[PDB]
Design a protein around this ligand. Structure first.
Ligand SMILES: [Mg+2]
Ligand SMILES: [Mg+2]
Ligand SMILES: [Mg+2]
Ligand SMILES: [Mg+2]
Ligand SMILES: [Zn+2]
Ligand SMILES: [Zn+2]
Ligand SMILES: [Zn+2]
Lengths: 61, 56, 133, 108, 127, 166, 50, 65, 47, 115, 83, 54, 55, 97
RNA sequence: UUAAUAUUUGUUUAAUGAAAAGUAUUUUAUUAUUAUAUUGUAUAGUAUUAUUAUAGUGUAUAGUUUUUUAAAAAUAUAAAAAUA
């Protein structure tokens, strides 16, 4: 139904928007657009502890 | 390009084989009578929206 | 609507799997690229240990003290080991109702891909393009 | 004529339920009326007490045909189909018995 | 309570070993959960049709397909145990088939009594 | 307001949802055995055991002992129809033949059967499966179903076979 | 009533309309999660006698 | 609602609330079994509805006996 | 059929909902192959 | 014409058949015995030879279909098209494999004859 | 000439050739997993003039492997028993 | 004549054999159940249970 | 507001030229000089003779 | 051993011969003069014969297209009648006792 | 009769375990390992082979393979200049 999809010569961004496959190095935004029960995207692993703590402590002191 | 024409062709082949078995000349054959009349019929359900249905 | 870019460009600072690579809970070598059984958490830092992001095994991304999963998939580094927030804050050990000895996390930085470093990295990199020199 | 019928039919028209069926075909149910009538007309000796009593016709008796085809003809009882109430008389009601052709035997 | 043991309701094993309808021999001393009272018909039909869902995540007696026939189950012969697989409590239940021997005139007896060749495919054999 | 009940003769009408007969007409794969027991079952059982009501009932001791005629005959004159599937041992040397067992037998009972009646003393294990009886339809379309059986794959020590002369 | 009149919020694409065909047993085996469900006494004795 | 006959073999519009019928895919008409059902009779072994009892006594008599 | 198409013999109109329901059904068949279900015809009786 | 939609069919080809390296002497009056077999060759051009890279590619693609998994795919396609209502599709019990040992042997003999 | 063979790859990787081949087919064909089946590929009885059709005969490779199913998906009780 | 072992007994024998192998290698054998007492572990406030899973 | 049509109203379609050109009409054909089969000019056969010299 | 399986199969079927129909069956008037030991001996004989006959019938039912009807089907009926007569005699003696 | 009708039209697959539900003739469905009786494994529902991924775990590059047609009006969507 999309004009960009009906156009005979598809752009690279248009072909990227069709990367709904749950795969390594896929369209992460187009895979996040679908619900959490549909896409297997867990929570973002944020590294906490002394490694960021001492850094921000120096930068704030 | 007609289904009826194909059916009549099959019937013509069968009738020609029968006439040759009877002994008639193939090159002098001629369709003297061709006619069709209704035969057996079958029904098929036609489910329609809003809880309706008919029978094809 | 998601408000984060896709296919993060690493032309300013490429994020590649190093040839030598050990774990944080285990300090044992991991597979480089043949199997994604490891967990990559990149942040674009050469801060020790394991620069440009540390690594964890899927089975061992759990807390090292209570040997349980993570609450919000966020671990706490404690003197070289990864602890959980209830362990780091000093609270009592809470047994989760869901999976016990493994956490919900994707493989090969897939879960940490939507956040981090993107293009452009610095401000002086855009003016390099828009200037003729 | 099944292959001829399916050839004369068109490839676009599809017919479904070719290997299965919507309704369970293992619920026992009665036949059609004409089929039950065919059964009743063919197998009449299935009725209780159909056999004639007392039985008087045994092979070796000389008997005359009193009605039907071959009336007034005498014969000797050859066989006795007692449960069907039937007699096989000698040289009476002789009909041709067509035997189909097998692989190594022609039709006799 | 119930007449049958409680492992038939919830087996002693953590997996649920020993769940189902168990038929017993009339002369046996063990008692099972196969009862045809108007009050027991509901749970018997439930075990036969619906099955039993265990908290471990498995159907113990009837997962699906052909339903079991508790009227033709072999008679119960004991109780489960954690050490071994099964303890045979009632041994008289098991049919120890035993036949006599050739002692006597048993060498002349045949299946049939004597009253006073290349096979071919046929459609019907009368006698 | 009352009805004109003086116009009907005292006969009970049929209920509007008419009940289906207790006989089970389904002969498929999910055929269910009826747990409800009727009076006729007990009547036929008594008449078959001790000729009810023409013969006096035996005492409770004889009725509950092993010498009661049904149990005595089932022990001394056993009736078990163990038949061999030829498609397993016909012109093929196999280590695990297949038998069709009455659904009431067990693995140990089958082992005893084969060991004592035929002499098969080398039995490793038995795998049993309960199959519905083979159903079919005759020429007139009536549904028939054979007796239920149990497929028993019996693993042996030495491979056995049966040779069919060509 | 939401969505359909007879079916309500129960959408045709989501789930089954009637999940009770014949009879359904609400009970769940070993719902108490007891360490030994074999009974009061079964197999090994528990605790010293008397 | 019900602008024709009541039997399933009728030819007009029906409705479920007034004339509920069981699902009958294809069945012979009022005159005889048509070729569209004899195709099933020869391939599947029975008419495609499953409600008809296969009565092949006549062809049995013609061939096997 | 040239004279017929010239003189407009037949329905000048056509079905409009099909060019979208076709791709909807193709996506549904993809989903069915994903869920390991046999593919069925879109219109078994509406034909 | 195509029976399904009565559309007009057209045979499109290239003209200089003899000046080509591949398809030199190929006969298109009738298709091959199988779709994975090499196409027909006239009796006059029996000794012709094909380019080795194209020959290896065709041999790989044809050996793809000589497995039993292809026979399973074939029977499963029979089952699928029979369930989808398509007529004149036999039963997967009545179907027979496109590729067997003796047929492959005689086809190899014919291929060595055509060199 | 050395084309890829599933058995050769499984022998190289030590990955149970049966399990390796099952990795490239629907799970319901090799395991006891909920999956729909076409009614045509299921067996049918014999008719006058034709032999019987068996699903195991017409699809020998599409048979469920109980050994692999139990050793991969079903849980063993020997590791669970604690007496 | 083999004693009927369970998985808990097999894991306890695994601990025993690990301690024995450490003793044979010469390094300090750390037998886990030596720090086990009536109230639980002697020093460690942790929680351990047998049999251990994979 | 349509009503049943009589047999004479049904046969009026036959009087038109759109009905005759679609149903009641024959083909101009000849024998293919190579295949000896009936053939209409303009359409040819799948045959190396009928493709080079298409009669 | 294979000898224990060879008695499940008919020898005439293995040798591709016509299995003849036996003479008769064990009647009650003859079984009344037998002891209980001989009765159970001939009962086990009938049991083995019935097992063989049921195996034959099952084989022919499995291959009804290739193999025709099972030859000499009266053997099953004779075995059943003999077993029923044995049960009759045993029941009479049990009732007397 | 409408009805030479409306409707269908099978040329290109991005995703992974139950239970309720369904019983469709699994001919020995599987062939084996361990141990130890018994019991049961393939297919929903919306009157259908229907707008349809039933979200219970779990994670992921297997492309995990049925949508005709040679112009037009009206209509339906999408796009739609250096005019306002
Ligand atoms: Mg169920
Ligand atoms: Mg069904
Ligand atoms: Mg449904
Ligand atoms: Mg509806
Ligand atoms: Zn690690
Ligand atoms: Zn912790
Ligand atoms: Zn030509």
């Amino acid at each position: 139904k999309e004009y960009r999809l009906t156009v005979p010569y598809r752009s690279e961004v248009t072909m990227l928007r069709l990367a709904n496959h749950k795969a390594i190095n896929s369209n992460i935004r187009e895979l996040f657009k679908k619900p959490l029960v549909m896409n297997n995207i867990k929570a973002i692993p944020r590294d906490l502890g002394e490694i960021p703590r001492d850094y921000v402590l120096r930068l704030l002191f | 390009l007609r289904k009826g024409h194909q059916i009549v062709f099959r019937a013509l082949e069968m009738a020609q084989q029968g006439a040759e078995a009877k002994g008639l000349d193939k090159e002098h054959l001629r369709v003297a009578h061709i006619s069709c009349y209704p035969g057996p019929t079958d029904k098929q359900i036609d489910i329609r929206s809003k809880g309706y249905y008919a029978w094809k | 609507r998601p408000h984060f870019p896709a296919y993060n460009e690493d032309v300013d600072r490429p994020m590649v799997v190093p040839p030598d690579a050990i774990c944080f809970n285990c300090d044992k070598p991991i597979d480089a690229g043949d199997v994604n059984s490891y967990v990559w958490i990149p942040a674009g830092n050469a801060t020790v240990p394991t620069p440009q992001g540390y690594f964890f095994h899927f089975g061992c991304f759990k807390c090292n003290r209570c040997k349980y999963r993570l609450g919000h998939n966020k671990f706490y580094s404690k003197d070289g080991k990864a602890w959980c927030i209830p362990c780091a804050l000093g609270r009592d050990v809470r047994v989760p109702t869901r999976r016990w000895h493994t956490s919900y996390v994707n493989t090969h930085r897939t879960g940490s891909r939507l956040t981090g470093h993107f293009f452009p990295r610095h401000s002086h990199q855009m003016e390099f393009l828009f200037d003729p020199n | 004529r099944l292959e001829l019928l399916e050839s004369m039919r068109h490839p676009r028209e599809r017919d479904f339920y070719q290997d299965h069926t919507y309704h369970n075909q293992w619920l026992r149910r009665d036949l059609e009326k004409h089929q039950k009538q065919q059964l009743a007309a063919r197998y009449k000796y299935f009725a209780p007490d159909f056999e004639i009593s007392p039985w008087i016709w045994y092979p070796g008796d000389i008997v005359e045909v009193v009605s039907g085809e071959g009336i007034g003809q005498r014969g000797t009882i050859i066989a006795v189909i007692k449960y069907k109430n039937e007699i096989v008389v000698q040289n009476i009601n002789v009909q041709d018995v067509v035997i189909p052709a097998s692989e190594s035997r022609p039709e006799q | 309570k119930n007449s049958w043991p409680e492992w038939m309701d919830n087996g002693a094993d953590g997996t649920g070993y020993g769940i189902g309808l168990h038929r017993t021999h009339p002369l046996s001393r063990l008692r099972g959960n196969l009862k045809r009272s108007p009050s027991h018909v509901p749970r018997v039909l439930g075990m036969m049709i619906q099955g039993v869902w265990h908290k471990s995540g498995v159907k113990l007696y009837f997962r699906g397909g052909k339903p079991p026939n508790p009227s033709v189950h072999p008679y119960l012969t004991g109780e489960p145990c954690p050490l071994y697989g099964w303890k045979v409590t009632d041994e008289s239940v098991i049919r120890q088939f035993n036949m006599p021997s050739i002692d006597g005139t048993n060498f002349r007896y045949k299946p049939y009594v004597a009253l006073q060749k290349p096979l071919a495919k046929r459609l019907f054999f009368w006698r | 307001k009352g009805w004109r009940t003086w116009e009907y003769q005292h006969t009970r009408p049929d209920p509007r949802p008419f009940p289906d007969p207790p006989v089970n007409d389904y002969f498929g794969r999910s055929r269910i055995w009826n747990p409800i027991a009727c009076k006729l079952g007990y009547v036929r059982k008594k008449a078959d055991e001790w000729g009810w009501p023409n013969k006096p009932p035996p005492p409770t001791g004889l009725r509950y002992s092993q010498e009661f005629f049904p149990f005595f005959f089932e022990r001394y004159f056993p009736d078990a129809e163990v038949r061999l599937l030829l498609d397993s041992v016909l012109n093929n040397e196999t280590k695990r033949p297949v038998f069709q067992i009455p659904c009431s037998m067990s693995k140990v009972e089958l082992v005893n059967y084969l060991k004592n009646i035929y002499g098969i003393d080398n039995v490793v294990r038995v795998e049993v499966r309960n199959r519905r009886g083979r159903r079919y339809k005759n020429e007139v379309g009536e549904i028939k179903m054979m007796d239920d059986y149990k497929v028993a794959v019996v693993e042996l020590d030495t491979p056995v076979s049966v040779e069919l002369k060509q | 009533k939401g969505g359909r009149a007879k079916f309500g919020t129960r959408a045709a694409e989501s789930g089954v309309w009637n999940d009770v065909g014949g009879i359904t047993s609400r009970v769940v085996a070993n719902m108490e999660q007891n360490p030994h469900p074999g009974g009061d006494d079964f197999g090994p004795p528990r605790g010293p006698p008397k | 609602y019900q602008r024709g006959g009541w039997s399933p073999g009728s030819k007009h519009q029906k409705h479920m609330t007034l004339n509920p019928t069981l699902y009958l895919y294809r069945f012979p008409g009022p005159h005889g079994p048509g070729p569209y059902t004899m195709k099933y009779w020869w391939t599947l072994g029975c008419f495609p509805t499953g409600m008809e009892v296969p009565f092949r006594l006549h062809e049995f008599l013609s061939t096997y006996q | 059929s040239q004279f017929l198409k010239r003189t407009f013999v037949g329905g000048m109109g056509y079905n409009v909902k099909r060019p979208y329901r076709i791709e909807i059904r193709m996506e549904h068949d993809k989903k069915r192959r994903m869920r390991r279900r046999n593919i069925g015809c879109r219109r078994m009786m509406k034909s | 014409r195509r029976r399904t939609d009565a559309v007009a069919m057209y045979f499109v080809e290239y003209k200089n058949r003899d000046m080509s390296d591949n398809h030199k002497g190929e006969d298109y009056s009738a298709g091959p015995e199988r779709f994975f077999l090499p196409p027909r060759i006239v009796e006059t051009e029996k000794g012709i030879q094909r380019p080795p890279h194209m020959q290896m590619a065709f041999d790989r693609w044809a050996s793809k279909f000589k497995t039993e998994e292809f026979h399973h795919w074939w029977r499963l396609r029979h089952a699928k098209l029979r369930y989808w209502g398509v007529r004149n599709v036999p039963h997967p019990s009545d179907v027979d494999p496109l590729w067997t040992e003796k047929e492959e042997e005689e086809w190899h003999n014919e291929m060595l004859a055509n060199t | 000439r050395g084309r890829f063979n599933m058995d050769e790859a499984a022998a190289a990787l030590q990955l149970n050739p049966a399990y390796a081949a099952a990795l490239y087919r629907p799970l319901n064909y090799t395991f006891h997993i909920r999956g729909q089946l076409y009614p045509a590929q299921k067996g049918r009885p014999s008719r006058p003039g034709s032999l019987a059709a068996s699903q195991g005969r017409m699809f020998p490779l599409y048979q469920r492997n109980d050994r692999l199913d139990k050793e991969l998906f079903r849980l063993n009780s020997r590791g669970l028993t604690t007496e | 004549g083999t004693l009927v072992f369970s998985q808990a007994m097999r894991d306890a024998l695994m601990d025993l054999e690990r301690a024995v192998r450490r003793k044979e290698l010469g390094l300090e054998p750390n037998y886990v159940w030596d720090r086990w007492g009536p109230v639980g572990f002697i020093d460690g406030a942790r929680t351990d249970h047998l049999p251990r899973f994979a | 507001p349509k009503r049943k049509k009589n047999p004479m109203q049904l046969r009026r379609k036959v009087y038109g030229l759109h009905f005759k050109e679609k149903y009641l009409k024959m083909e101009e054909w000849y024998y293919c000089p190579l295949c000896a089969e009936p053939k209409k000019p303009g359409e040819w056969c799948r045959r190396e003779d009928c493709r080079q010299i298409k009669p | 051993s294979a000898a224990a399986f060879y008695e499940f199969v008919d020898n005439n079927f293995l040798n591709n011969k016509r299995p003849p129909v036996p003479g008769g069956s064990w009647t009650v008037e003859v079984l009344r003069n037998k002891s209980l030991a001989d009765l159970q001996h001939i009962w086990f004989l009938l049991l083995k014969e019935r097992n063989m006959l049921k195996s034959m019938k099952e084989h022919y039912l499995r291959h009804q297209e290739e193999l025709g009807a099972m030859p000499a089907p009266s053997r099953l009926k004779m075995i059943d009648e003999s077993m029923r007569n044995i049960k009759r005699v045993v029941k009479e003696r049990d009732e007397e006792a």
